């Protein structure tokens, strides 16, 4: 329908910035700065009024073309020049492209009777500069107006006419012609001759499609004749410009934003023409385009005043949702002349069709209160955050081109530029000064540190700032021009120390918002304390600037300057500063998170502590459940509200489970005391979940205690009651390593583990080999295949010993210890062979308990535990057990997946309330379930599962963790109807039996531990299931991980697609999610 701004950021334009955070890498480049009195021919030879830039990109080049006269608008003489670039930093000087033209002697009009022309010039005035042909010829075009007076309009439709002249590829320029002729001029009354008589056919050729394309009328129509039949839309809209949007319709915009739409090429607009809904716009021109990233971006005037100069983003080219800066300074206007008004204003990109620059990032140019001509770098994709803290060595970078994550603002008399390790800041600028910024982070702590030179102490000014998203600087430090360095605490300054000209200072300054202080560190030693001149939230920018900021002009100076500055053209003597290895950190509790921040969600902690009584308090008491989350958790978010939910409950829920001991953390399974639990209310069966739920907390010491608890708490010894449970333990601790990489918390852990399994070995095995287990000492009393006091061999305890084993055979080559790999890798060979030859039941196809005759003859959930250890074989014929998942008759139910087949007549005739594994959905089945289905659909080449089977059982499990509309966490509950069965009973309250964000981590979104140095993810979401997801600050291996997904590219401003990034630096992408794998990456 139409270009509109829905955003909710305003710019303020009592400042020049309009307190607008700028975008991640602009850099502000002067390319003419004005100056009568020193002419020359990189200044355009002294004129002061330039205005009205045009750019395009040809044959590896920038052409950036402009139009000046001497002083005043509209007060001849008038041309137009051209400079062009290779990087866009360093340029030709200006060449007259169009010169001065005379208006012919007798020329009139109907609104100055009794005036006459006699020896006048005329005024240029274009609103399109270049045409990039089909035969790939550049282009490029002015045209010719007559201004009488001051106050005439050379744009009245009573000009001369346009003019067009061929760029070569050599420099050099073909002839200037007319492509068009205003009403009473021809080719026997004008000074060039008509386009068509050029011998140069395809010269020809190319100012014919000029003129065959309506998207080039539209920017002819106020010059042109009123009412010209070559115009598409005769009404004065003004300055043109127009974008395809990804359907192939083409979005136009002009002056005040006014908007449409053409579905035919440009031939035809939708009326009525408004404004666009929400822009701020006014009349120094907005700017809009795709972008090389598929996206769209607009460049305006945010505001009634020419400034700031801004950006607003769009994922489709209609709607636009930010707001930020491009350029924020006001350089003072030198000299005065007529309609010459304050800021960067007449932005202006390149058309589509003339040039794609190389670097793929956005340029713009603009002038400076009609004086300066600017061109403005903005990196894309977009970015408004810092994703990492700054440790910069500009060594590392040959040109600034390359400081990609510092914001650049650099006037020809004031430059920054490399020199080896040092950022430097040269200002010989009375007017102006030269400008860094470093945005990092938002930080409520922080931590900045530079190394810093000075050429001078007697002369010049370095202001360094620590800024806001608002502009606010908290503080500021001042290298003065008595020899100074000193910081602002207030209306007075802590001079620090007298610094010398040529000397290398180390400069560290701690920032703190919450105590509102900054110390500042030279060489070492403290050398100032003070508080925040001004309150702020967050730090995200550091600044060095080489001046004070201007407060002229304001809201309200004056329209119009008539006067020039003392000594407009004149010089300041020279000043130059240095940087280098500019370092920033932060110790906020969430600043190894890259994008998602805890603030954003701590308002589920808060919601979880307020919507029910808080029954048990343990460790961790639901007023410090937040604090500990902050510190700990991983974080998640998606578009679906019930995930996202679930993702924090159930982090929420296990932190009550942590329960302090005489000997360090225990990890309860009960919150209510049972009368079979060991020391501490402490129960076995469900350590393995404990540890593969809890290897992802970033403070070790929980964990690491919960296990030494386990295996050392019993005088020294491990607890007696884990011979009551079945166990998976080594292979617990092997995963926890596999995520944490702490290899001597694991190689410690090594001899405790093998007790372990030799008990389980003299206890618990057949004459045949096959473990036996009573179904109770499984947790999983009452179900069908069954087994109180019998010893049958279950698939659980012999996949778990397979696990066991091949896990010890593992912690056996990391110990250097070559005998245990092979006792342990024998362990493993021959259960394995024995549950393939023994368990897997041929009649039924699935693997189930052998009791001591024969087959039980029931396929239970028990039955998927070989794949929780990737034990069977990669051979077809196991494949067809998963097919039990999607089969109402096998494990698929209304509230997700059943302990049993529901074909089985055996199912759930054992009575309800009792805790019975007969068919009941068990979250603690369902989780073994559901790991070994991701291990399954990860590791085997499978056709049987979609990613949207496993996406709907997880959807599935989200959903019955529901009860009395509160999130919830239970014993199990009925498949059909999903009552949680024991109802509203205390006991099940919490229930710590289960995994779900181990889950979330390693399946959903796909994060698959291992033991090297590699990085792989795989996220079994659907296509098109949601349009954004983030899992952030994981602690993996030592470094901290962050997974993203952005189809459309706006949720995060870092580019589109399956994104991985190592403490916020990106480490891999991937276009859809599918398998991305990082080598070495950490
Ligand atoms: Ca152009
Ligand atoms: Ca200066
Ligand atoms: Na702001």
């Not at 340029?91 to 100055?112: A, C, H, L, M």
């Not at 995200?540 to 053209?569: C, H, K, N, S």
């Not at 700990?632 to 939910?645: A, G, K, V, Y």
Request: hydrophobic content about 35%.
């Amino acid at each position: 329908d139409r270009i509109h701004y829905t955003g909710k950021e305003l710019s303020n334009p009592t400042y020049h910035d309009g307190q607008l955070s700028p975008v991640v890498g602009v850099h502000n480049i002067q390319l003419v700065r004005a100056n009568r009195e020193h002419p020359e021919a990189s200044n355009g030879n002294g004129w002061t009024y330039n205005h009205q830039p045009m750019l395009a990109y040809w044959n590896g080049q920038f052409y950036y073309q402009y139009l000046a006269d001497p002083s005043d608008e509209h007060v001849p003489p008038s041309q137009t020049f051209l400079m062009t670039s290779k990087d866009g930093y360093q340029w030709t000087n200006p060449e007259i492209v169009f010169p001065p033209y005379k208006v012919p002697d007798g020329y009139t009009k109907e609104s100055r009777p009794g005036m006459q022309a006699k020896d006048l010039i005329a005024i240029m005035h274009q609103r399109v500069g270049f045409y990039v042909s089909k035969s790939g010829r550049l282009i490029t075009m002015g045209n010719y107006g007559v201004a009488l007076d001051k106050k005439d309009d050379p744009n009245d439709g009573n000009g001369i006419g346009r003019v067009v002249r061929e760029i070569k590829k050599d420099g050099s320029f073909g002839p200037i012609y007319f492509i068009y002729y205003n009403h009473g001029f021809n080719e026997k009354n004008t000074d060039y001759p008509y386009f068509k008589k050029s011998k140069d056919r395809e010269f020809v050729k190319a100012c014919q499609e000029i003129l065959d394309n309506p998207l080039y009328m539209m920017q002819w129509v106020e010059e042109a004749d009123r009412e010209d039949p070559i115009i598409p839309l005769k009404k004065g809209y003004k300055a043109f410009n127009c974008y395809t949007l990804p359907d192939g319709r083409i979005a136009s915009l002009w002056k005040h934003a006014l908007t449409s739409i053409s579905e035919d090429g440009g031939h035809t607009w939708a009326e009525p023409v408004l404004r666009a809904k929400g822009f701020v716009n006014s009349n120094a021109k907005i700017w809009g385009q795709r972008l090389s990233d598929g996206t769209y971006a607009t460049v305006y005037n945010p505001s009634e005043f020419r400034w700031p100069l801004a950006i607003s983003l769009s994922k489709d080219g209609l709607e636009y949702t930010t707001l930020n800066l491009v350029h924020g300074e006001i350089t003072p206007m030198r000299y005065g002349g007529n309609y010459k008004s304050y800021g960067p204003q007449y932005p202006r990109g390149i058309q589509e069709g003339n040039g794609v620059p190389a670097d793929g990032d956005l340029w713009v140019s603009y002038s400076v209160n009609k004086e300066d001509m600017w061109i403005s770098r903005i990196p894309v994709p977009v970015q408004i955050n810092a994703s990492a803290h700054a440790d910069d060595d500009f060594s590392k970078s040959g040109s600034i081109a390359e400081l990609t994550n510092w914001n650049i603002y650099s006037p020809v008399w004031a430059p920054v530029s490399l020199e080896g390790e040092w950022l430097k800041l040269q200002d010989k600028d009375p007017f102006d000064y030269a400008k860094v910024e470093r945005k990092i982070p938002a930080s409520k702590e922080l931590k900045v540190s530079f190394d810093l030179s000075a050429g001078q102490n007697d002369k010049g000014i370095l202001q360094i700032d620590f800024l806001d998203e608002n502009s606010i600087a908290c503080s500021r430090l001042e290298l003065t021009p008595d020899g100074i360095f000193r910081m602002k605490g207030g209306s007075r300054f802590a001079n620090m120390m007298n610094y010398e000209a040529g000397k290398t200072y180390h400069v560290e300054a701690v920032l703190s918002t919450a105590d509102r202080n900054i110390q500042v560190y030279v060489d070492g030693k403290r050398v100032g304390l003070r508080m925040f001149y001004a309150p702020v939230a967050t730090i995200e920018r550091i600044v060095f600037r080489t001046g004070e900021m201007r407060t002229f002009p304001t809201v309200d100076t004056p329209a119009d300057q008539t006067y020039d500055l003392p000594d407009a053209g004149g010089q300041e003597p020279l000043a130059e500063y240095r940087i280098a290895n500019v370092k920033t950190s932060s110790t906020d509790k969430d600043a190894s998170s890259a994008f998602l921040k805890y603030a954003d969600f701590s308002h589920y902690a808060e919601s979880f502590n307020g919507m029910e009584d808080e029954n048990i308090v343990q460790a961790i008491p639901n007023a410090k459940a937040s604090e500990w989350m902050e510190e700990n958790i991983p974080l998640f978010e998606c578009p679906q509200r019930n995930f996202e939910e679930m993702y924090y409950y159930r982090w929420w829920s296990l932190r009550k489970h942590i329960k302090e001991t005489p000997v360090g953390y225990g990890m309860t399974e009960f919150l209510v005391q049972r009368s079979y639990s060991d020391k501490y209310n402490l129960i076995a069966c469900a350590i393995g979940h404990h540890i593969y739920e809890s290897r992802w907390l970033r403070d070790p010491k929980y964990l690491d205690q919960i296990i030494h608890t386990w295996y050392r708490g019993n005088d020294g010894g491990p607890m007696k009651k884990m011979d009551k449970f079945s166990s998976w333990n080594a292979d617990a601790v092997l995963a926890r390593y596999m995520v944490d990489g702490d290899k001597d918390f694991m190689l410690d852990m090594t001899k405790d583990l093998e007790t372990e399994y030799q008990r389980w070995e003299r206890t618990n095995r057949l004459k045949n080999g096959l473990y036996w287990q009573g179904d109770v000492q499984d947790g999983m009393e009452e179900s069908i295949s069954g087994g109180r006091n019998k010893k049958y061999a279950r698939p659980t305890i012999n996949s778990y010993m397979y696990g066991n084993a091949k896990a010890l055979s593992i912690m056996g080559i990391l110990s250097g210890d070559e005998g245990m790999a092979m006792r342990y890798g024998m362990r493993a060979d021959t259960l394995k062979s024995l549950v393939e030859n023994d368990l897997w039941n041929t009649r039924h196809q699935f693997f189930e308990t052998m009791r001591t005759d024969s087959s039980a003859n029931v396929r239970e959930a028990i039955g998927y535990i070989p794949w929780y250890f990737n034990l069977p074989d990669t051979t077809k014929k196991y494949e067809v057990a998963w097919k039990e998942i999607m089969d109402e008759k096998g494990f698929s139910a209304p509230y997700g997946l059943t302990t049993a087949e529901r074909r089985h007549p055996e199912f759930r005739t054992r009575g309800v309330g009792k805790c019975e594994w007969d068919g009941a959905i068990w979250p603690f089945a369902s989780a073994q379930t559901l790991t070994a289905m991701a291990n399954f659909m990860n590791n085997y080449p499978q056709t049987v599962l979609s990613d949207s089977v496993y996406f709907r059982q997880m959807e599935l499990y989200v959903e019955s963790q529901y009860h009395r509309g509160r999130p919830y966490i239970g014993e199990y509950l009925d498949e059909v109807t999903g009552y949680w069965l024991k109802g509203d009973q205390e006991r099940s309250r919490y229930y710590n039996h289960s995994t779900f964000n181990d889950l979330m981590i390693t399946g959903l979104i796909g994060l698959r531990p291992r033991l090297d140095d590699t990085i792989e993810i795989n996220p079994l979401i659907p296509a098109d299931k949601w349009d954004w997801f983030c899992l952030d600050n994981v602690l993996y291996h030592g470094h901290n991980l962050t997974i993203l997904w952005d189809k459309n590219g706006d949720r995060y401003h870092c580019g589109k697609g399956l994104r991985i990034f190592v403490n916020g630096k990106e480490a891999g992408h991937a276009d859809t999610l599918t398998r991305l794998v990082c080598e070495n990456a950490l």
